[PDB]
Design a protein around this motif. Structure first.
Motif, PDB file in Angstrom:
ATOM      1  N   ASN A  12     -35.297 164.574 -34.727  1.00  0.00           N
ATOM      2  CA  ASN A  12     -35.343 164.382 -33.275  1.00  0.00           C
ATOM      3  C   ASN A  12     -36.679 163.759 -32.841  1.00  0.00           C
ATOM      4  O   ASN A  12     -36.659 162.768 -32.120  1.00  0.00           O
ATOM      5  N   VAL A  13     -37.790 164.134 -33.487  1.00  0.00           N
ATOM      6  CA  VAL A  13     -39.082 163.433 -33.412  1.00  0.00           C
ATOM      7  C   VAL A  13     -38.953 162.009 -33.955  1.00  0.00           C
ATOM      8  O   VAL A  13     -39.255 161.063 -33.232  1.00  0.00           O
ATOM      9  N   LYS A  14     -38.282 161.822 -35.103  1.00  0.00           N
ATOM     10  CA  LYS A  14     -37.931 160.489 -35.626  1.00  0.00           C
ATOM     11  C   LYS A  14     -37.039 159.689 -34.664  1.00  0.00           C
ATOM     12  O   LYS A  14     -37.303 158.513 -34.442  1.00  0.00           O
ATOM     13  N   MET A  15     -36.061 160.323 -34.015  1.00  0.00           N
ATOM     14  CA  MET A  15     -35.209 159.680 -33.004  1.00  0.00           C
ATOM     15  C   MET A  15     -35.976 159.280 -31.731  1.00  0.00           C
ATOM     16  O   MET A  15     -35.756 158.187 -31.211  1.00  0.00           O
ATOM     17  N   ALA A  16     -36.878 160.131 -31.241  1.00  0.00           N
ATOM     18  CA  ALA A  16     -37.705 159.862 -30.068  1.00  0.00           C
ATOM     19  C   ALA A  16     -38.694 158.718 -30.337  1.00  0.00           C
ATOM     20  O   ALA A  16     -38.684 157.728 -29.603  1.00  0.00           O
ATOM     21  N   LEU A  17     -39.303 158.726 -31.530  1.00  0.00           N
ATOM     22  CA  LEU A  17     -40.073 157.606 -32.062  1.00  0.00           C
ATOM     23  C   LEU A  17     -39.227 156.331 -32.154  1.00  0.00           C
ATOM     24  O   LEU A  17     -39.679 155.304 -31.672  1.00  0.00           O
ATOM     25  N   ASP A  18     -37.964 156.383 -32.586  1.00  0.00           N
ATOM     26  CA  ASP A  18     -37.094 155.196 -32.598  1.00  0.00           C
ATOM     27  C   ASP A  18     -36.865 154.590 -31.194  1.00  0.00           C
ATOM     28  O   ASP A  18     -36.988 153.374 -31.042  1.00  0.00           O
ATOM     29  N   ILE A  19     -36.693 155.399 -30.140  1.00  0.00           N
ATOM     30  CA  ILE A  19     -36.559 154.904 -28.750  1.00  0.00           C
ATOM     31  C   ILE A  19     -37.889 154.347 -28.203  1.00  0.00           C
ATOM     32  O   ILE A  19     -37.917 153.296 -27.547  1.00  0.00           O
ATOM     33  N   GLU A  20     -39.000 155.045 -28.439  1.00  0.00           N
ATOM     34  CA  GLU A  20     -40.335 154.620 -27.998  1.00  0.00           C
ATOM     35  C   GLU A  20     -40.786 153.340 -28.708  1.00  0.00           C
ATOM     36  O   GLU A  20     -41.143 152.354 -28.052  1.00  0.00           O
ATOM     37  N   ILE A  21     -40.527 153.266 -30.016  1.00  0.00           N
ATOM     38  CA  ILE A  21     -40.713 152.072 -30.834  1.00  0.00           C
ATOM     39  C   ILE A  21     -39.785 150.955 -30.338  1.00  0.00           C
ATOM     40  O   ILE A  21     -40.287 149.850 -30.203  1.00  0.00           O
ATOM     41  N   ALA A  22     -38.575 151.200 -29.810  1.00  0.00           N
ATOM     42  CA  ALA A  22     -37.788 150.145 -29.136  1.00  0.00           C
ATOM     43  C   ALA A  22     -38.434 149.601 -27.865  1.00  0.00           C
ATOM     44  O   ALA A  22     -38.451 148.386 -27.644  1.00  0.00           O
ATOM     45  N   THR A  23     -38.927 150.498 -27.018  1.00  0.00           N
ATOM     46  CA  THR A  23     -39.537 150.139 -25.733  1.00  0.00           C
ATOM     47  C   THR A  23     -40.825 149.332 -25.937  1.00  0.00           C
ATOM     48  O   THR A  23     -41.021 148.311 -25.279  1.00  0.00           O
ATOM     49  N   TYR A  24     -41.563 149.642 -27.007  1.00  0.00           N
ATOM     50  CA  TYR A  24     -42.696 148.864 -27.506  1.00  0.00           C
ATOM     51  C   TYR A  24     -42.273 147.533 -28.155  1.00  0.00           C
ATOM     52  O   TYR A  24     -42.738 146.464 -27.760  1.00  0.00           O
ATOM     53  N   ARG A  25     -41.296 147.569 -29.071  1.00  0.00           N
ATOM     54  CA  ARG A  25     -40.819 146.430 -29.873  1.00  0.00           C
ATOM     55  C   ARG A  25     -40.225 145.329 -29.020  1.00  0.00           C
ATOM     56  O   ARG A  25     -40.667 144.202 -29.151  1.00  0.00           O
ATOM     57  N   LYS A  26     -39.387 145.655 -28.032  1.00  0.00           N
ATOM     58  CA  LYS A  26     -38.804 144.676 -27.098  1.00  0.00           C
ATOM     59  C   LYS A  26     -39.841 144.005 -26.173  1.00  0.00           C
ATOM     60  O   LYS A  26     -39.491 143.034 -25.507  1.00  0.00           O
ATOM     61  N   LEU A  27     -41.101 144.454 -26.173  1.00  0.00           N
ATOM     62  CA  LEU A  27     -42.203 143.834 -25.429  1.00  0.00           C
ATOM     63  C   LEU A  27     -43.271 143.173 -26.311  1.00  0.00           C
ATOM     64  O   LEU A  27     -43.645 142.048 -26.005  1.00  0.00           O
ATOM     65  N   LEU A  28     -43.783 143.838 -27.356  1.00  0.00           N
ATOM     66  CA  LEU A  28     -44.823 143.264 -28.226  1.00  0.00           C
ATOM     67  C   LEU A  28     -44.230 142.329 -29.276  1.00  0.00           C
ATOM     68  O   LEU A  28     -44.364 141.117 -29.160  1.00  0.00           O
ATOM     69  N   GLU A  29     -43.397 142.870 -30.167  1.00  0.00           N
ATOM     70  CA  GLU A  29     -42.584 142.048 -31.071  1.00  0.00           C
ATOM     71  C   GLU A  29     -41.535 141.226 -30.276  1.00  0.00           C
ATOM     72  O   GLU A  29     -41.060 140.186 -30.706  1.00  0.00           O
ATOM     73  N   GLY A  30     -41.323 141.582 -29.006  1.00  0.00           N
ATOM     74  CA  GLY A  30     -40.546 140.855 -28.012  1.00  0.00           C
ATOM     75  C   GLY A  30     -41.343 139.871 -27.140  1.00  0.00           C
ATOM     76  O   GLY A  30     -40.727 139.269 -26.255  1.00  0.00           O
ATOM     77  N   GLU A  31     -42.627 139.627 -27.433  1.00  0.00           N
ATOM     78  CA  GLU A  31     -43.399 138.410 -27.086  1.00  0.00           C
ATOM     79  C   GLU A  31     -43.772 137.602 -28.328  1.00  0.00           C
ATOM     80  O   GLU A  31     -43.487 136.402 -28.311  1.00  0.00           O
ATOM     81  N   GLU A  32     -43.980 138.285 -29.469  1.00  0.00           N
ATOM     82  CA  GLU A  32     -43.726 137.672 -30.774  1.00  0.00           C
ATOM     83  C   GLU A  32     -42.315 137.065 -30.786  1.00  0.00           C
ATOM     84  O   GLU A  32     -42.241 135.935 -31.196  1.00  0.00           O
ATOM     85  N   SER A  33     -41.340 137.539 -29.985  1.00  0.00           N
ATOM     86  CA  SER A  33     -40.069 136.868 -29.618  1.00  0.00           C
ATOM     87  C   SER A  33     -40.081 135.364 -29.484  1.00  0.00           C
ATOM     88  O   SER A  33     -39.072 134.738 -29.811  1.00  0.00           O
ATOM     89  N   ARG A  34     -41.095 134.791 -28.842  1.00  0.00           N
ATOM     90  CA  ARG A  34     -41.168 133.336 -28.643  1.00  0.00           C
ATOM     91  C   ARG A  34     -41.769 132.623 -29.887  1.00  0.00           C
ATOM     92  O   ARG A  34     -41.979 131.414 -29.886  1.00  0.00           O
ATOM     93  N   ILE A  35     -41.645 133.373 -30.990  1.00  0.00           N
ATOM     94  CA  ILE A  35     -41.915 133.244 -32.426  1.00  0.00           C
ATOM     95  C   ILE A  35     -40.950 134.183 -33.277  1.00  0.00           C
ATOM     96  O   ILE A  35     -41.035 134.142 -34.502  1.00  0.00           O
ATOM     97  N   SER A  36     -40.135 135.104 -32.683  1.00  0.00           N
ATOM     98  CA  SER A  36     -39.651 136.402 -33.283  1.00  0.00           C
ATOM     99  C   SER A  36     -38.416 137.119 -32.558  1.00  0.00           C
ATOM    100  O   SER A  36     -37.464 136.356 -32.447  1.00  0.00           O
ATOM    101  N   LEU A  37     -38.363 138.435 -32.079  1.00  0.00           N
ATOM    102  CA  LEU A  37     -37.462 139.203 -31.066  1.00  0.00           C
ATOM    103  C   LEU A  37     -37.364 140.837 -31.148  1.00  0.00           C
ATOM    104  O   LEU A  37     -38.460 141.385 -31.166  1.00  0.00           O
ATOM    105  N   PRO A  38     -36.275 141.712 -30.997  1.00  0.00           N
ATOM    106  CA  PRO A  38     -36.373 143.156 -30.519  1.00  0.00           C
ATOM    107  C   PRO A  38     -35.970 144.449 -31.373  1.00  0.00           C
ATOM    108  O   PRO A  38     -36.873 145.233 -31.653  1.00  0.00           O
ATOM    109  N   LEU A  39     -34.698 144.947 -31.312  1.00  0.00           N
ATOM    110  CA  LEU A  39     -34.215 146.384 -31.175  1.00  0.00           C
ATOM    111  C   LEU A  39     -34.426 147.425 -32.338  1.00  0.00           C
ATOM    112  O   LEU A  39     -33.588 147.512 -33.229  1.00  0.00           O
TER     113      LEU A  39
END
Lengths: 51, 52, 52, 52, 52, 51, 52, 52, 52, 52
Positions: free
Chosen positions: D25-52
């Protein structure tokens, strides 16, 4: 002193018998404490691409 | 990839009904799965995995 | 793009360092319960053999 | 002697499944928080990269 | 620098906090044994009081 | 059965001696089990997570 | 800061709190089992005091 | 090398799969050390000492 | 190609255990050293200290 | 006194049933955590054109 000496045997042996079932019980519960550690290792999956 | 080398499992032994009394001087076994130590043998090696 | 391929070779050389440590870490975890607990669980057993 | 350890068992084991579930459940909460981070940081690497 | 920085040490701090949660769970199995020993010795002492 | 049980009282002085060093091997086992938990915590995490 | 990463370490502190809170409930469960051994073997001791 | 940052961004996303496969392999060795020691081996021993 | 059989049959025997009403079975409970397991635990500390 | 020894051996058997199912919950946890790291990895294949 059959009753007293063999009961002085048993009153100690039942304490160690109960404490060894309690060590087995604490160790089948410490299996669940290592399972909360294995759950942390399962949740670390999580993070972003490095450099 | 074969399980049970030589076909082995704990087959039932049952002998002559010897009624010996045995006063039962226990070896107590503090290693009734000292197992926290063998999960810890895996963590004496997860500690090696993180450092590596 | 040789500057960007140098970050991507940093990632592929960090993979190579992550594997260097983690193939040691799997080997330390698959051993440490055979070393430290690998003597304490052997006294734990010899006192059961001593009990009978 | 049977009840105290069969209840230590019954209580611990209904906890260990939930304790593994809560590490997961800590691993699951980390998976959602890592999504919210990933869709923005690796999701500006998006214009080189992308998300989920 | 190709490598960012600190980004490594923050993921290594992350996996070390997940490993310190696993260490706190390992030491909480030594706490669980300690309360299972409180139980086992209470069960022995009340047994030896009824055997008496 | 009392001569048996009174010799059996001297057996617990030997068995309590033996079980006190078994409980010392089990205490050393907890100290090795805590070192192994700290090794496992470092071993599962230095690879840098999901990326 | 191109992706927050630290939000994972704050979830692992939360999974440590939820794991330690679950083990603190198991310490209380083994203390309740100790008291159930006290009460059950006191009830057996009362049935033996009635024979005595 | 606009296509080698590329294959190695894809490689670090595959090596993310190797990092979880390695952390999950330490986890799945530690889970077998957990089961092998905690409930089995420590139960298997102290259930014969309690019989002695 | 390594087809080599690493599994050797650890040969068990248990011929039918007659009336052991001969009482002359002295107790000995000699265990466990196993100082090679504490040498292996020290080699796991040394292998981690090399990995560090 | 034989129902003590026998039902304590059936406690530790009943505990080993739940602890072997805790080891199956560690396996089944790694099965779903591998699966849900695969539910990260469609988004990490999206996150650099990369881990499929």
């Amino acid at each position: 002193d059959v009753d007293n000496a063999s009961l002085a045997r048993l009153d100690l042996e039942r304490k160690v018998e109960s404490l060894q079932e309690e060590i087995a019980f604490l160790k089948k519960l410490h299996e669940e404490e290592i399972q909360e550690l294995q759950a942390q290792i399962q949740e670390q999956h999580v993070q972003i691409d490095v450099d | 990839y074969a399980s049970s080398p030589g076909g082995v499992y704990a087959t039932r032994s049952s002998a002559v009904r010897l009624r010996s009394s045995v006063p039962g001087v226990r070896l107590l076994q503090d290693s009734v799965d000292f197992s926290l130590a063998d999960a810890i043998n895996t963590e004496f090696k997860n500690t090696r995995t993180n450092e590596k | 793009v040789e500057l960007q391929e140098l970050n991507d070779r940093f990632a592929n050389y960090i993979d190579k360092v992550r594997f260097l440590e983690q193939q040691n870490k799997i080997l330390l975890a698959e051993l440490e319960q055979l070393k430290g607990q690998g003597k304490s669980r052997l006294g734990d057993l010899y006192e059961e053999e001593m009990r009978e | 002697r049977l009840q105290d350890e069969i209840q230590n068992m019954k209580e611990e084991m209904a906890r260990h499944l939930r304790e593994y579930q809560d590490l997961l459940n800590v691993k699951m909460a980390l998976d959602i928080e890592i999504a919210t981070y990933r869709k923005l940081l690796e999701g500006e690497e998006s214009r080189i990269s992308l998300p989920l | 620098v190709s490598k960012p920085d600190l980004t490594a040490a923050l993921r290594d701090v992350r996996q070390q906090y997940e490993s310190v949660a696993a260490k706190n769970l390992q030491e909480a199995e030594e706490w669980y044994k300690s309360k299972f020993a409180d139980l086992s010795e209470a069960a022995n002492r009340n047994n030896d009081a009824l055997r008496q």
